[PDB]
Amino acid sequence: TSIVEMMQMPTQQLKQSVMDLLTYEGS
Amino acid sequence: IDEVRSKNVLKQITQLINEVTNITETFPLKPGQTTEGLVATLDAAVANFLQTGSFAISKCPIANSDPRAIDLLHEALGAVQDTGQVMIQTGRDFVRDSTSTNKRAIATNSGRNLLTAVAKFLILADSIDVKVIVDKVDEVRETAHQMIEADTKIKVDDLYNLLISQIEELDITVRRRAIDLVKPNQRDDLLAARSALRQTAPLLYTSTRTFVRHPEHEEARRNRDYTADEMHSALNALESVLNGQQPK
Numbered sequence: 282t283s284i285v286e287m288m289q290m291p292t293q294q295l296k297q298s299v300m301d302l303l304t305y306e307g308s
Numbered sequence: 309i310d311e312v313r314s315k316n317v318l319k320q321i322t323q324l325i326n327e328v329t330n331i332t333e334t335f336p337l338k339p340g341q342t343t344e345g346l347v348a349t350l351d352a353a354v355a356n357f358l359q360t361g362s363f364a365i366s367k368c369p370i371a372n373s374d375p376r377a378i379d380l381l382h383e384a385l386g387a388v389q390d391t392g393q394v395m396i397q398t399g400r401d402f403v404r405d406s407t408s409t410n411k412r413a414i415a416t417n418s419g420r421n422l423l424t425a426v427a428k429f430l431i432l433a434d435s436i437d438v439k440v441i442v443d444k445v446d447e448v449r450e451t452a453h454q455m456i457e458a459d460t461k462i463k464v465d466d467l468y469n470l471l472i473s474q475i476e477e478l479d480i481t482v483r484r485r486a487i488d489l490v491k492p493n494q495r496d497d498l499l500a501a502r503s504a505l506r507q508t509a510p511l512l513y514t515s516t517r518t519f520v521r522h523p524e525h526e527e528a529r530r531n532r533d534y535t536a537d538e539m540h541s542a543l544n545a546l547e548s549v550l551n552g553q554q555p556k
Binding site: 283284289291295298299302303305307 | 314316317320323324327328331333334335336337338343346347349350352353354356357360361363364365368381395399402403406407412415416419422423426429430433434436437440
């Protein structure tokens with residue numbers, strides 16, 4: 282497989298973890 | 309963005325950039341989650357990206373052949389590590405003072421920078437993936453070169469046995485690349501060059517084999533030269549299109 286292919290899942294999880302933090306509404 | 313030639317990459321980077329620059333609604337913590345947990349997850353996700361990225365780079369088949377390429381990849385991965393660090397810090401600052409509009413903005417900016425660095429890594433990764441295909445074209449080109457130069461029937465057959473497999477391997481990767489290409493004209497051009505290679509190589513085999521058996525035969529010489537030219541044009545066309553250029 283290719284580098285792009287191997288990075289698909291880790292890209293998604295990193296994306297997910299950034300968006301989860303930035304869309305936190307606060308206290 | 310216009311340099312992006314892979315639809316797989318294009319969709320991923322479109323997600324990365326659009327989502328982080330278009331935050332409107334915000335949400336409570338998912339059940340069981342904490343502010344410190346949000347940072348922990350982010351930290352682990354950065355780390356896993358770096359680990360998988362390092363592994364992917366180390367397995368890249370042109371690791372030997374193209375050292376500057378691997379250097380760019382490590383540099384680009386380093387930019388993810390660095391922006392990742394800033395994101396973890398500013399992110400932590402934000403979640404710990406989560407009503408601070410200004411700390412939210414800084415963390416959001418950190419997020420843009422990090423996901424942009426991820427996008428640049430993927431774009432570079434695709435270019436290296438393309439270099440691997442080009443390396444395969446070069447291998448086919450050299451085997452064909454040797455076949456044309458062979459001075460015995462047994463050499464011509466043995467070299468064509470190698471060429472059959474190399475072209476079959478290349479054919480698979482080129483067809484898949486064609487499906488992933490953003491621009492339909494590059495897609496169509498790549499497929500045309502693929503077809504030309506598949507048609508020309510068997511003719512090169514039989515023209516070379518006939519010519520080694522009958523060198524005095526001037527139409528045999530002409531046919532071999534002509535099919536060789538056709539072969540070279542197809543291979544050059546594949547390389548041209550893979551590099552985002554028009555053939556010929």
